[PDB]
């Protein structure tokens, strides 16, 4: 209902960042829940036809032994950011001879994202990232916007119908939630407003523990869906 | 495998295209400003997945 | 000040005035040229002011050797008393701090002469409204609350689209004096209608043709169909000839 | 009316298939005074005209020396003329200093055209705004060449460039059938007569507004100025 | 602020003074003296033509001058013949901006127009401003073109200006004023390829000498030719930009 | 990067106008300490009680700052401040003066308004700290690169009324931490209904030759607002 | 394409690049040139207009010699054509130096077409405004004919025409049986077509330029002798 | 038949339809805001005279230097913006001193001219970095020296090229000064006559009164070196008038 | 000036219209391509049009050989497609030089997509208006079909189509794949899909067919006689 050629919106924010957020809000839903021991990440991987090959590309990607992430927005930007995140983690490990903390990696990725909001002749990234990690026996969960502003959460959702997902999470969250219950709650949140039949091939689930981060095999996803 | 080999195999156009792409991407450059990361330059140069 | 070409000015009671606006692309001026050339109006006087840059030339609508040597100025008035129509044409540009006085003087003349209604042809930038521009028609209309109810009913029957408001005030970027004219007509209670189009600078003959067809859908100055006489002065719109020893 | 959007940059094509900046640059040649060049079976002659102002304020170098067998005359922008003259001098000097042999005039002109074509295609640059007449002698004999801001060059029997050179061109076309058999004196007389056509009906050639450059067989390029043009000026008839 | 705008407006005013007394006239110039003929020249070449071929005979007395300031501005002096006080002559050698043209018209002409007054205007334009189907450089410049009002009984000595070509600025302002207020007038245009002080450009105005307006003001040609030839030898020094 | 015909910087003016729509921050200097008070515009129950847009950052053990503007630019500037302080400490074996740190950041902020083709930072700062040269201090900054010392100031939304009330109810050399906190609560309530969960309070002081920076708890904020309510009820 | 036609890095709403289209339109204000591939060679023909009588005969040539065995005919901007000819010469020389044998016409056409296409992607340069054809002959390869346009597309042809009147020339060429003829008849056919598609009133007097490369020349590009040109011109004039 | 706006004076690489460079023309026009300078070269030497205008009695006249000494045999006079000529003067001094220090000869006036002109044409260079000069210099110069070819005089304008001359005047009153010089200069005149004529023309064109404090004068001779007149010499010469 | 004239400017709804226009530019060619993967083979079939009778038909093709074991079919602008093919060959050579073994199909497709992504985030260069489909055989995975687009998005398929009539081709292929292939059945399926979608009876000189097989892992282009034999067998 309004198009602006200026830099700052009348509400006091950057116009291009608002447009990038509008682009992000039209993507596939994503859900992240932090439990007492571990973090669970989930996303919707609905495909347009049976002609596709689900074993080709993945939306949940691991950065290192203990860090993984998921996105909601434009695929190519996520692909170009994942490689930079992995390179930064490897550089930190080479320099300091120790695994990078989650907060440092989030800070560096956010700085890289912010760099593109000030220069001329470029455009900001159109993605929002959810990052999970494990440090000193304590799970972490972060969310970053296209402008590079990050906050730490306990349960959050983005993409389509994220307000209803946030309401659902607020209504059905507990401080002493277990990993299995967290996975069940995340799958239920994804099932809410799915407009279809959920199988073990059209969703992706990843978990983080004290043993590291890994992506669930579709057999395990089918087993989890059997309980529901 | 370098610019001379590419010119001898394909022609004069390939190194010219590569250098024009490099110059167009490198326009984000200034001395009195803060440190910068050359994401697009590393992607085009092909060294975005290796550590020097 | 209206200066008649003859001795005494004619009467314009119950007449409708067609007016252009100096906007982006000169679409209104080109449409006025098309209308005057096709409908074959005759000069009746001049609108002498001090707000437009002076210019002079011969007859732009010459059709024979006899009338091809008539001088013309930057603001002239034509009329067709058979169908109660009067037209104004501007062939120049405005000087600084001289648009509002021109609008005030023109509306004073419109009130004093006894005209019935005013129609303004204008244009606006084609890259500044919304994503709705790319998936909708490029024609918009505006109306004054003083307009007759029959006109409103006819416009609603024609299935047109009204110009969107801006947060509520009317904003027409690249429209020239059309916003000032609309505001002053609303203040002075004068029936005014505005028809515009989203364009870009370049070759704008199809834009003028589309605008005159859009106007004809309502006024029906020609036969109702999907035709227009091109003036003889549309000759060298891109310049002179090509120099030799290049191609 | 519609030319506003397409006549500001050299890298923008018009919808008619034209580039207006090249034509505008070619229009800058007529801002200088006129020059005349002609050749015979054994000689090549350049004749130039100096500005009508006083000589105290400025001394003008209209005819320049490039090599022992090449000389040029200029009309247009002084900076562009200086750049082109330096380029030609460097090319000729390199050829001699390395290979111990003179540089062919056709090769030099081709190099000039190739160099001048470049700025007509890049962004943020403008075409050269100077015109050249080149006279030289080599194994193939005398030569007269003309260069254009549009990076085009021509081979001529006689040519005139500058301001109001159409009358000189008409005279050269009318009298071109007898240049081959003329000797040096008659060739210079023909050049002066052609150059005189660009002046008002009352003015006449004078030793203070005429420059002459001559190259030919067994004669290196030489520039005659001031009192040196008196032998050539003597013998001319009334208009 | 409004103060800077007011200062700028006051800095660009037009004043009609009298250099004999250095006092500005409080009444329009034409409202003080009767007029029957009025000749106006704009530019270097037209001023030189009038000063060489017309103002070399009789006694001409100055009655006023105009003062103005632009980023491009040079004088504007008015004369009238002593033997015939009803014949006026103006020589504008400066540039009048678009916001000063109507001030100039008001100062010179006023709000009260009168009939029985012929007006002739002379000016020059570059040949590149001409529009033609063929190339610009193939035209035999310089040439002469004319525009007239609707009550000019006489005929021009040159072909009328072709259609897609238009004229603006001060000559257009004067012609528009004359056309609106029903005053006979004519404008002469010289399209030339040399816009500086040139002998051929000045001599391009010769056919106008045989018209009825200038019939009684030209006495002898050779003296005018000698004066013009002497005058052409005092031109300003040019820059080192061209060669 | 372009001078207006009247001699003004449109980009800087736009940045300041945009900052004028941000949250409200407060700073009051007392005889024995200095405090910062901010407004929490956004809040959710699901935040992780850390990195929850904590507007009071800690640069060193002696200094702290508050931000009203773009969060990412604020993060960049704070990170740069931390590196500057650490580098100076490593070089000189001595903590950096607060004014020197502010000047170092202001030089970077000013360079962007003169060089290159990048937009300036749309962030305003508020620094509090202690050093042996001058003791307790309080500074301010703006996108143009200007800075100055104050005794009580406010930035953000409705800052003019807060400044007017501060200048009306502020007395030099007679106020302590408790009076400063009460005045800050009154000003924030007037400029914002206020809830104890919508504000953040931080204080700086000295404890046996050691700078101590603390953030007030929800219970303490509730106690303070209850005392203010009791006082305003007793007044009427 | 108003609003999307000021740069070569912009797409039209219907998926078009208008700067390249304007560059291709810039070829239509140049004199027409044709080329016909025959059983044992290729013949070129150019309609050349005379500018003035002060120019020496043989100047402003539009039929170049790229190498010992390659002929070239251009149309459009002359300076762009000369630069492209220099590029082609450099490529042929490099291939000769490296691989030790003459470059096939297909590879040369591909290299030059890619070089031309490289100028239609960025906003720092402008597309070329010329078109040209290449011809060659060999004992083990036969006759070859190619075309390159400003967009950067190259194809092989049996008969080609570029310039202002390419449509009428192509219509005239379509009526020929060049697959079974010889060069001695193709020269006359080319002269007749050039004389037919010429406009006498709009354009002034012209001169005819002809060339071939083929078996009777032993794989060399040369100029037609004067007697053959005179006979072909007489035949064309008497037929027209 | 419509009047529209069109501008061609926005950049330095744009040609007008008649083939002109309006930015360079404006840079040249900027010289009209400077003071008047006069330079005359004869068979015995070169004479330079300049006018310095003091805008307030509180200003110090000694703080205005419009005639400088490049070397022992070269002098210069400025007109326009004095701040722009500093780089050119420094470049000329460095070139001359370096050449002497390296080879033990003296550069020619033409060589110093070329060295200076290389820097003044930095705008419009093929590969000039954006951090260097991007606009024409707003100053005009008048070089005068004695070489083995005899006395020489050169003139430079914001265009960027030097031109040799015999008697040139620059500044606001350049037209009147040149008109006066035209009827005075001749080939057989001497240095004292040149000094007297230049002082007479300066007095004629100056709005103030010639009082040997608001002017400067210098001469270069083949025998002696660059010499600048003092107050006593200026008064002695002026009292002749 | 405008949200659709800039490649590096988002629209209020978060869209990049230059990429959409580049997608629209693919249909300018007017041709359709179909790729079908079998049990142990991959088949690509394209449509050939040679309207001019003065044009040498041997010089018109859309099937390319990137590597001795990798094939390709291009849809869209001809010059852009040829430039893309040259870039793919250069990238394959560089990968082989750097890593000592031949590049896989998925890695080549990923590299091409990564290169294409940069053109969408910088304003001084424009995307290429072409679509690339690659086929090959992996050492431990079998036949593979991959596809690119101007936006920088890539994925693996069992069957896909590009150009005009892509929606109809996908609708036709969906039912066949759901219903549920030997070497003869894959070629027959692809040819039948193209013929039914185009509503034209094909001739041996009107199409191009390229295949790859597990037994013979080298890319091969079928001849007119083989295409005619396949057409006779189908009919």
Residue numbers in the entry:
A (entry chain A): 6 to 233
B (entry chain H): 62 to 113
C (entry chain J): 1 to 167, 177 to 235, 244 to 264
D (entry chain E): 1 to 239
E (entry chain I): 34 to 106, 119 to 288
F (entry chain B): 10 to 201, 205 to 248
G (entry chain F): 5 to 244
H (entry chain D): 1 to 241
What do the paper's sentences say?
Dedicated assembly factors orchestrate the stepwise production of many molecular machines, including the 28-subunit proteasome core particle (CP) that mediates protein degradation. The CP is composed of four stacked α-rings and β-rings, each containing seven distinct α or β subunits. Unlike conventional proteases, the proteasome harbors three different types of active site (β1 or caspase-like, β2 or trypsin-like and β5 or chymotrypsin-like), each present twice. Previous work identified five CP chaperones: proteasome maturation protein (POMP, also called hUmp1)29–34 and proteasome assembly chaperones 1–4 (PAC1–PAC4).
Structure 1 represents an early CP subcomplex and consists of the α-ring, all five chaperones and β2. Structure 1 shows PAC1/PAC2 and PAC3/PAC4 within the same complex and illustrates POMP-dependent initiation of β-ring assembly through its binding of both the α-ring and β2. Together, PAC1/PAC2 and PAC3/PAC4 bind all seven α subunits (zoomed-out views). PAC1/PAC2 is perched atop the α-ring, on the surface recognized by proteasome activators. PAC3/PAC4 sit on the opposite face of the α-ring (that is, the future site of β4–β7 subunits later during assembly). Consistent with the structure of the orthologous isolated yeast Pba3/Pba4–α5 complex, PAC3/PAC4 occupy the α3–α7 side of the ring, with α5 binding at the PAC3/PAC4 interface. By occupying these sites, PAC3/PAC4 not only stabilize the α-ring to provide a platform for β-ring assembly, but also preclude incorporation of the late β subunits, helping to order the incorporation of β subunits. Unexpectedly, PAC3/PAC4 and the β-ring chaperone POMP directly interact. In structure 1, one end of POMP is enclosed by PAC3, α7 and α1, with the other end enclosed by PAC4, α3 and α4. Lastly, structure 1 reveals β-ring initiation with β2; a PAC3/PAC4-bound complete α-ring engages POMP, which co-recruits β2.
